[PDB]
Every structure is written in C-alpha cells, then in structure tokens.
Design a protein around this nucleic acid. Structure first.
Ligand SMILES: Nc1ccn([C@@H]2O[C@H](COP(=O)(O)OP(=O)(O)OP(=O)(O)O)[C@@H](O)[C@H]2O)c(=O)n1
Ligand SMILES: [Mn+2]
Ligand SMILES: [Mn+2]
Ligand SMILES: [Mn+2]
Length: 437
RNA sequence: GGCCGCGGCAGGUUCGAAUCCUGCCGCGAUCGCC
C-alpha cells in the first residue's frame, strides 16, 4: 500500500495468467500450421508478437506480405482469400483497408494484407507501416514488455486506451513508443505531467522539442504524427491522472470503474434539481463500422449543439450513445422555454435606402430606434429546444453526416422527460452531467 | 468508405453583408485522421 508497492500488485491484473498464455501459444502453433501449408509470406505483429498484450484481452495480429506489382484489387482479393481459408469462423467488415476478423481455437485473429517493402521511405498505403513497426520495436522493447502492460492497463482502465474514434486516446503503438523513450511506466508518468498541447516528442533522436500541436514523431516516420488521433480532451485527462497518481498513488487507477447505475427515478430527481431541459434525438442505427459511425455522431451532435447555441437555448453539454438498434444524441439546455418574440437588428438611421426596405417588411409589432439604428420585434417559429431541434433535424438532415443524416431523414423523434430515462442512455447522461457516486 | 483541415465557385438567411447557414468542385501524396 506504499507508493512503489502498488505497481507490483497491479501486475496481477495487467499480466496474462498461465491459463491464457497456453491458449495463445496453442493458437499460434495452429495458425503457422495453416499458413505454412499455403506457402505464403507472412509476419506476426501486434502485441502478441512482442508479448505486451493485456490480461483477459488476447488478440493476434497477422500481416500478409505481397509483391509491389500486385494491384490494389489483387492484394485485397488474395489477402481476404487467405484469411478466410485460415480462420475457423470469419467475418469480413472493414473501412480504410481490407482485413479478416475471425476465431482460431477460441482466440481472435486479424489477417491484414500489405506490401513487403525495403526502407520505409516510399510507402503506398497506410497499412504498410506495421511491418517496419515490428522490426524497429521488437529489438528495443524486449524485456520491457511488462512496463508496457502497465501503461496500457493504466489507460484502458480509465477508458482512454482506444485509438479508434470511439475513444480518441493513445494507440498501443504509442504506448510502446513511450516505454522505450522513458524506460518505464513510473518514469513515463512523471514527464507526462508537464506535457502541453505544443509538446513535440521525437523518439528517434531521443529529443523533445516544441511545435504547433502535440506531436509524437514515428521513429519510422519523421513527418507522420503517432498521436494524431489523440483528442486534446483525453490528452488533458491523462496529464491530470498522472498528477493524481504521483501525488497520491492508488490501486484504483488500474481498476475498471463502476457502470454508474442510476435508477430511472433518481435520474429524474437529478434533472429536476438541475432544472435544465434534457432531451434526446433517437433514430435507427446505420449498419456501418464504428470508425465510420462515431465520427458522424460527433458531427451530428455538434451541428445540433451549434444550432442550440445560436438559437439562444444556451446548451451546456452534448453526449451520444450507440446501442445495437438505435442511436441517441443527448443534449442539456439551460433554457426550457424561450419567448415568442425577439429583436432583429436593422440599418442605421442615415441611409434611407436600406431603412425603407427594412420597414417595408410586414411585422406583427411596430419597429423602433435604439442608439441611432433601427430595430424590430420578430416572431420565432418555435419556443422550446425540442421544437427547435426537430425543426432543424427535419430540414438540415443532410449535413448531419452521410449515413447518420439519411437515417434521420427517414424517421427520428425527440425523447424527453420520463420517456427518456427509460432508455439505455443513463450512464451517458450521468457522465454528461458529472454526477458523482 | 466515413470524418477532419484548407482552397474555389453557386446559392440562402438578411435592410445589406466581411460575420452566419447550406449545395457543388478541387487540394491533402510518408497515401491528413481510422
Ligand atoms: N485491422 C487492422 C489493421 C492494422 N493493424 C495494424 O497492426 C498494428 C498493431 O495493431 P493493434 O492491435 O491495434 O495494436 P496493439 O499493439 O496490438 O494493441 P492491443 O494490445 O490492444 O492488441 C498496427 O500498426 C496496425 O496498423 C491491425 O492490428 N488491425
Ligand atoms: Mn492487437
Ligand atoms: Mn477513400
Ligand atoms: Mn435574398
């Protein structure tokens, strides 16, 4: 329970037990049996090759090496073909580049096609980077794999480990690049408290300089940012969590957190005490990969948020949740109801060309002069945030994202009040409103 | 394929528009991000 004693007891949760390691080595021995029988040039990469994989998470990455003269089409079709014939049961769904997901003796395997290239200089696709990553890392990461399991386990327990758009955190490749640079988990945490948004970490030259944005330079790639998809928000949370660890270390930092289960009655009580308008935009989940979905949910959420802003409903925060069937865009507003009337600005009293055009407009109330410029009372087409967002989502469906926006066109509705609390959005609402427990 | 950052046109809102909201085309070459 001392400061340095906790990093030892944490290794129980982040390091794989012997029951799991066997299951993996048995699967690897099976994959090679099948891959060698087909006589294909392959390489084992990822966390499994370097033995950095987290306990209770076993995922074997396998890359396929093809000649440069193979077409982008030929690479995909033969790549997928090998993947299908290798895995016991498979499912092919991709976005940027083709790959095959499946199961081999109970463990998950990823078969990704790419090119075999010498020197990383001219690289065609984005997947061609990985063979150079494994080459460069396996030599320097050997023996320190347990420090990588610590850093990864630290992040994942706080939910900032995913590099996908569902998280926007530190990629597993970045984790290994940090342990190599700072030598250990404990030391890595220390310097990360002084990180700014302008920090440039060049691992290749062992140098840290300053720059435009938070930039981790790939040893393989001087012009590519390893931390590119790391959100500024999660960057700050990491910096913060590092400060809270060093000052007062704890075993809770490596522990998965609570679901924050709030009964639908208590949540209603919270919204009342806040006195805010809480509503959601519900629509059918488009059937698409998460990396194509969540960037669209963000955009959809932001567009409606910016609308709420300029319509003077004074939004607070905006979250979103994706279940298996439906998607939810959640919002909180300070204004439950605004007035029918507002004041539109007119032209200054001097130029009568524009004034006369301004007064010509048929209006319910007389206009007026204030500080030497004309003003007029105009009427809103909606008095509540819910009415406003419905009017918005109906007309501006198209700019809410390619797939998401079209799903809103077909049908959507606004869930408010007790109807809203009966939906699987509770954990997201509490996190949004910051309820502690 | 989706998203993002810019650049160029064409509209709309408006008294008018540099702000603001949409539509289309183009740029991204360690293939901007996955
Ligand atoms: N569908 C794909 C495409 C590419 N890669 C490549 O394989 C490398 C490592 O992949 P990843 O599993 O995501 O990183 P890990 O270190 O293995 O993280 P984890 O321990 O969670 O498995 C990356 O360079 C990535 O480009 C992959 O694993 N899966
Ligand atoms: Mn992996
Ligand atoms: Mn594309
Ligand atoms: Mn006009």
């Amino acid at each position: 329970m001392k400061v340095e004693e906790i990093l030892e007891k944490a290794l129980e949760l982040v390091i794989p037990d012997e029951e799991e390691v066997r299951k993996g080595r048995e699967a690897e021995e099976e994959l090679r049996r099948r891959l060698d029988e087909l006589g294909v040039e392959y390489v084992f990469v990822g966390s499994y090759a370097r033995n950095t994989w987290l306990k209770g998470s076993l995922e074997i990455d396998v890359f396929l090496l093809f000649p440069e003269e193979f077409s982008k089409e030929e690479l995909r079709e033969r790549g997928l073909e090998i993947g299908k014939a290798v895995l016991d049961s498979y499912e092919i769904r991709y976005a940027e580049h083709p790959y095959v997901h499946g199961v081999v003796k109970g463990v998950e395997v990823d078969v990704v096609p790419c090119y075999k290239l010498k020197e990383p200089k001219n690289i065609k696709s984005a997947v061609d980077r990985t063979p150079f990553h494994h080459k460069w890392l396996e030599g320097r990461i050997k023996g320190k794999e347990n420090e990588v399991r610590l850093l990864k386990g630290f992040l994942k327990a706080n939910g900032i480990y995913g590099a996908e758009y569902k998280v926007r955190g530190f990629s597993g490749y970045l984790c290994e690049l940090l342990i190599v640079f700072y030598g250990s988990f404990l030391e890595t945490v220390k310097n990360a408290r002084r990180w700014t948004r302008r920090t440039v970490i060049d691992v290749a030259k062992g140098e840290v300089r300053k720059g435009e944005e938070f930039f981790v330079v790939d040893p393989v790639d001087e012009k590519r940012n390893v931390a590119a998809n790391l959100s500024l928000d999660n960057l700050a949370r990491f910096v913060h969590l590092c400060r809270e660890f060093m000052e007062a270390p704890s075993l809770g930092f490596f522990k998965p957190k609570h679901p924050l289960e709030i009964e639908p009655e208590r949540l209603r009580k919270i919204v009342e005490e806040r006195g805010t308008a809480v509503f959601a935009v519900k629509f059918r989940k488009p059937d698409i990969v998460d990396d194509n979905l969540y960037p669209q949910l963000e955009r959809a959420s932001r567009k409606i948020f910016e609308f709420l802003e300029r319509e003077n409903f004074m939004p607070l925060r905006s979250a979103f949740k994706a279940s298996e069937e439906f998607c939810y865009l959640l919002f909180e507003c300070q204004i439950k109801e605004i007035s029918r009337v507002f004041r539109r600005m007119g032209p200054q009293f001097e130029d009568e060309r524009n004034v006369k055009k301004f007064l010509s407009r048929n209006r319910a109330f007389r206009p007026f002069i204030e500080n030497g410029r004309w003003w007029a009372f105009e009427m809103r087409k909606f008095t509540t945030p819910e009415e406003g967002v419905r009017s918005y989502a109906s007309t501006h469906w198209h700019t809410l994202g390619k797939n998401v926006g079209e799903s809103i066109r077909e049908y959507f509705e606004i869930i408010s009040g007790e109807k809203l609390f009966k939906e699987p959005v509770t954990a997201e609402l509490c996190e949004m409103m910051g309820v502690k427990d």
